Structures are given as structure tokens and as C-alpha cells.
Design a protein around this ligand. Sequence first.
Ligand SMILES: Nc1ncnc2c1ncn2[C@@H]1O[C@H](COP(=O)(O)OP(=O)(O)O)[C@@H](O)[C@H]1O
Ligand SMILES: Nc1ncnc2c1ncn2[C@@H]1O[C@H](COP(=O)(O)OP(=O)(O)O)[C@@H](O)[C@H]1O
Ligand SMILES: [Fe+3]
Ligand SMILES: [Fe+3]
Lengths: 384, 384
Amino acid sequence: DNFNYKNDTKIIFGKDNYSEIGKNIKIFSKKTPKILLHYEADGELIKKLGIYEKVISSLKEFDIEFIELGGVVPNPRLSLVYEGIKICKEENITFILAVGGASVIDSAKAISLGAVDNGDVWDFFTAKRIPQDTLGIGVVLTIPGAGSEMSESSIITDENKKQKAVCDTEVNFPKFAILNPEVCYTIPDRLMAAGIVDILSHLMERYFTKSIDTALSDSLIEATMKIVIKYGPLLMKDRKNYNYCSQIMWAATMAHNGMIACGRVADWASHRIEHEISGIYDLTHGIGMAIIFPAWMKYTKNIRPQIFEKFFKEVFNTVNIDEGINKLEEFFKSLGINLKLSDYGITEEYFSLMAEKALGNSETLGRFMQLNKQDIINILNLAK
Amino acid sequence: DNFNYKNDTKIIFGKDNYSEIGKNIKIFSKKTPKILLHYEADGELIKKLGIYEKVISSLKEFDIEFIELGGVVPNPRLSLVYEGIKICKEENITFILAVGGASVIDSAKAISLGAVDNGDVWDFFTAKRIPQDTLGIGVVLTIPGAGSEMSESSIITDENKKQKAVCDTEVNFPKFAILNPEVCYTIPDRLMAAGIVDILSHLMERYFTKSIDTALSDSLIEATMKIVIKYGPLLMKDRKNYNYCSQIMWAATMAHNGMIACGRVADWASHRIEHEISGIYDLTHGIGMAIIFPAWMKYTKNIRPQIFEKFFKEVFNTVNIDEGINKLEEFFKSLGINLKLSDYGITEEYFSLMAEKALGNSETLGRFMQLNKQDIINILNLAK
Ligand SMILES: Nc1ncnc2c1ncn2[C@@H]1O[C@H](COP(=O)(O)OP(=O)(O)O)[C@@H](O)[C@H]1O
Ligand SMILES: Nc1ncnc2c1ncn2[C@@H]1O[C@H](COP(=O)(O)OP(=O)(O)O)[C@@H](O)[C@H]1O
Ligand SMILES: [Fe+3]
Ligand SMILES: [Fe+3]
């Protein structure tokens, strides 16, 4: 149970600090800076929220020239990376400012790769060549989900082949990421609640593990989880509260940190099951992770019951798995979330279809518990 | 209460992995690698422990040429950095492997600065010039104290001026740090116990703070502290237990991480008081941090009692400060440590002298509580 850890992304955390955009562009861009401002669509949100302008007022404040590129799709297209690469070689862009969420942060990362490369950028997603440099990006995050602002991955889709892929390498690490919890305020309720689940789930998938000798790390993952459990409901009912937003945003960041999860095997079973509820139904990840995970832990409560007893003792102050599973259920409902799939008029109709697609060509699925097709149907019946 | 965080030092954590020395030298040294092996004195310990050879067997395993430099003093001298710089320009050393503890890790860092600089290296400790590059170092840590293996500081002393100084900049960050808990085994008892106190103390100095809105971070610092409290005594009585050593070593690393302490004001009062007990008496830091801190928290128990109630609830499972201060006292004794200065035949003789030297030219000392000369004498009388 050894492990390595790197993460060089600079964290600029806090509020009323919009100068550090400029400052940090100067610090990690060569020569004189000239940047690309990247965002989903035509600035429609970042502008409506007032980030756009205060962004611009930072660049002006620092004599930073800049072209803009827009038109990002929620799952972004190499269509537009080929666009942005042309522009960074054409206009000698020396640095890119991702303003938005993970799917512009993703597109930004892939432009930063090709801006510096001689060949085609797919070869870096194709598993053909391993990029050895990028220009470098700074992110201004508007929504604390998934942590692409601090990761080494980029998730793009080739729509004319519509084969999607990813590229995972230490070059993709942002040079810096601005994190202001104020951006949490304008987020809609059901989307805020699902992002609080994503954080807890990210933590639980690493926590529930067959690994041993993990006490310290157990403690840290417990601490973050417990904070998500305490504050998530408060933020839900006090959306503009900077403190509440700071604990939550900071929790999501730490959840994405391999210092606290350090040499322990993550189980992705709940993720994959949910992936296929979301493939056939219009349903938000986080909401599906609140209906499935309790189903899954109910079905896996016999593998290492001790590590379940521990979980619920540390986090819900109780040694009975049943009582604690229900407290976790109750905590999900305290963020607006109905706990069953029937409640979303999802029926048993495609449980079979979903279970086959989840397993694909494998026979089982999972690490904590190896789960086969009928196992998965049982879990879906538990969550019905 | 905003904050920034960077740390690019690569963590290689674990056991039976001595190849990664070689591997990681290849990865972060230009061209073909040729390195400097740096250590205290003439390899006397690292060799006696068998690190020396398994080091060499990694470099041979990787066709890595290398000169050696030895002769480090516990508080190291620019005498020898001027030596090692000459050799890295002379023999085109492209990378340095610090094998040892913080005072060779320190000397290594200062050689890495000058190897790449045109002028004198003092100017980087003098506050005259701000270095903009180093060659780069890898550390193999033999003792988990102070965390210089992951810091940006280097503490050298000019003995012919015998003015000591430091240089703190993002270039000093090791490229990688090998951390194998096995190195804990051979450490002597009183020195292992004091290093367990250094870790707890490092955490407590950041915990006890006038800052607010720090719940998540409170939780993480509690988690680590609580682990140091649970495992430290076990490691003390089972010195070769890899699990126990892994939690403790990993705790010290995290204690040195500004993700868990994030935008909170550290109080250095206990450090400074202890510094002057150690200036006049032969006494190990960690042991003096176990006699002074309880004295100090007794004397500061009225500032924000709530944050004391919290501390002892989360860490010693009790809401009474007195009961908990005594549990912390008892925990110190459970590692071999007598709790009073009288027990070391330290008398009240220089309490006055020590209090004046601690304050220097300032009138008070501290952030949690402003402590004046008599205040400090009171704390020393509490610890007598
Ligand atoms: N600060 C914010 N306030 C309100 N809505 C936001 C904010 N950030 C993102 N969104 C919205 O959330 C939806 C999906 O999130 P997205 O921005 O694609 O990134 P992620 O992939 O990290 O969730 C988008 O339609 C966008 O409208
Ligand atoms: N793995 C180890 N086993 C035994 N003794 C050690 C080990 N590492 C360091 N020491 C000893 O500890 C003493 C002081 O620690 P030092 O190595 O100077 O670094 P640090 O400054 O981090 O404590 C030295 O005299 C050395 O003999
Ligand atoms: Fe997930
Ligand atoms: Fe200290």
C-alpha cells in the first residue's frame, strides 16, 4: 500500500481578490502576456454574474492583451479545440484563462496542449504520443464540481467520429485556480444539492475499501465527509452565506486531493450504475448518486461490516448500520432530494438493460464487492 | 481570511521501493544525469543503516554517474555550500540527492541555488536578490521532523560571520521526496518521542487561533492530532511496527501541509519560549514543547475558551479544559517524557533572562494571547 502524490496547481482561495487574475497571469506567462479568455457559449452566464467585467478589469489593471473564444458545449468538442489552437499559434497566445466549469476547463487544457505541439492533438487523447509541455492555463472556477481545476485530465469528444476520450498527464495541471465561494450563491437549488452529493460520494467511493492500515487517511476522509454532512444542509437553506459556502467549496477541493485518500482502492460501482440510469433518463449525476449509494451500501453491508460500523460511528455517531444508512438517507432528503427512482417515474423497465450496459464485456463490476448482472438489478430494486 | 497554496514536491511514500530513487532522478534531471550525493559527515549513519548501499544500487541500476560530498553539521555551514557549488559547476552536476535530515536537506537546497547562479549565494539569504531557478534536488528522508523535504526554506549559518539566516522561495521545493517509514525504526526512544511532540505541536500552534469560519480545517487538524495521540504511544512501545510508523510519518507530512491549516493565524509563543530554554540548557526541542505547551494553554485558557472546549472534546473526548489538559499531560508522559523542568534540573535561575531574550526588542509576544515579560515568567513557573 505505497503511493505517490503530485499536485502543482496553485490555489487562490477566497473573496474580493479579483486582482490575482492579472497578478497570476503575469507570474506564469512568459515575456509579455497575451491571453485567450475561454468560456461556454458567448459569456452569457459569466457576464450575467459579473465575473466577465471584473475579469476584464483585472487584465486592464495589468496591461494584458487578450482575444476571446467562446462556444463550449457541456461535453466539449474537438471541433473547437482545433479552432482555439489555430488562434494561439496565429496570435501568439502565451496563456489561457479558463473562466467557467469543468467542460471549459477541459477545453482550455486541450488547447494548452496543442498550442505547443507540432502535430495533431488527438494523438494525445488517442494514446499515440505523450505530450511533454503545454502553454499553461489559469482557471477561474464558477462551479465547485469534479475538480478539473486541479486535475490532470481533459475530457473531449470528436463529434464527427463522436468517439469521446481523455488524456491524463501531469502537464494538464493548471498553473493556478481562482476559487471564490461567492460563485456558489447564484447556483440553482437542485444543482447545488447534487454538487453536495458529488463531494460526499467522491469521498465515500474512496472510503469504502478493502485496504488496511489506513487510519490517518480514514480520519481525514471522515472529517471532510462529516463537514459535508453538517454544512450542506445549512448552505441549502442560507444560499448566500459565505462561511457555509467556504466550508463546502473547500471540502470539494480536498475531496479531490490524494493526500487524504492515499494508497487506497476506490470502488466505482455506484458511479457506473448511475452512469446508465443517466444514459437512458434525464437525471443529474448527484441526484442519482443519492438514490444508488444507499442501495449499494445496503447490498454491500456484509463485506467488511467493521468498516461500515466505523463509517457511521465517525460520521453519523452511531454503530448500527441500519440506523446510519437511514440517517444518510435523511440527510439526502434534507437537501431536497427524493430518495427513490419511482419518484422520478423511472421504472424497472430497463434495469436489465442498464445492468448489461454497466458491466459491458466484463462479468462482474466493483472492487469492494464484485457485483454481477443480477447483483446490479438487486441494487436497482433496492433503489426503486 | 483568504489564502494561497502551492506545493509541487513529489511524494514517494512507502517501502521496498528503492528503485524510485533512480527513476525519479531520471525524471527530473536534464540530458543524462550526473548527481551529487549529500549527507552529514562521512555516510556514517546512512551507511550503518543500509541506505547508502541501496541508494547506490539504485543509481547503478540506472546508469547514473555521481560524486559524493559529505561533512554536514547539524546546523549547516556556508563553508560547505561554497564547496558543493564549486563542484556542481566544475563537474557539471545536474541534480543533487539529499540523503538524510533537515540540515543536509537544507545544505542540498542551497547548493541547488548556487549551482545555477552567476553571483554569490548569500545574496539569496541576505535579502539582496531573489533566486529564479535551481538545478533541483531529490531527498531521501531518514527522519520525519520539520518537513524541510517539502518546504521552501533553507537554514544555513555563516560561521566566519556566525550570522545565521534563511531563504524562503518556491524554487527550493524538492522535485521529489522519498518517504519510507522503515527509517523510523532505528531512531532512539527519546528522539522518537520528541519528534512525535514536534508533530502534535506543529498542529496545535496552527489550531489555537483567533480566526473564525474554519470548521473544515478545524476537522482536519483535529483528525491528524487525534491520530498522533492514538498512535504515538503505540509506536513508542512497538518501534518496528510498519503501520504505526506509517500513520505517524504521514501525520508529520500532513502537519506540514497548508491544505489543512488554510488561512489561519499560527501562534509561535510556545516555540519562542522553548527556543530560549534550549539556548541556555542542553534540551531537545520536542521535549521542551511538552513541558511548555501545557503551561501555555493553562495560561491562555481564558482567551477563547470555546476553542479550547472544542480542542479537548474532539481530541481527548472531554469538555473540561482541566481534565483535558491533564490528559494531554498524561499522553506526554506515555512517551517517556517527564513533564517538568525541575525534572531536568532546570531552575528558575534564568526564567527572567529567558523571558527578556524571547521578547527581544518587542514588548509582547504571541498572537492568540499577547504575552509580556512577566506573563512568560508565569508560564515558566507553571512548567517548573
Ligand atoms: N456559479 C454558477 N452559478 C450558476 N450556475 C452555474 C455556475 N457555474 C455553472 N453553472 C451552471 O451549471 C450547469 C452545468 O455545470 P458546468 O458549468 O457544465 O460545469 P461542471 O461540469 O463542473 O458541472 C451549466 O448549465 C451552468 O449553467
Ligand atoms: N533514521 C534515523 N535513525 C536513527 N537516527 C537518525 C535517523 N535520522 C536522523 N537521525 C539522528 O537524529 C539526529 C538529529 O536529526 P537530524 O538528522 O539532524 O535532522 P532533523 O534536523 O530533521 O532532526 C542526528 O544526530 C542523527 O544521528
Ligand atoms: Fe463519482
Ligand atoms: Fe514548533
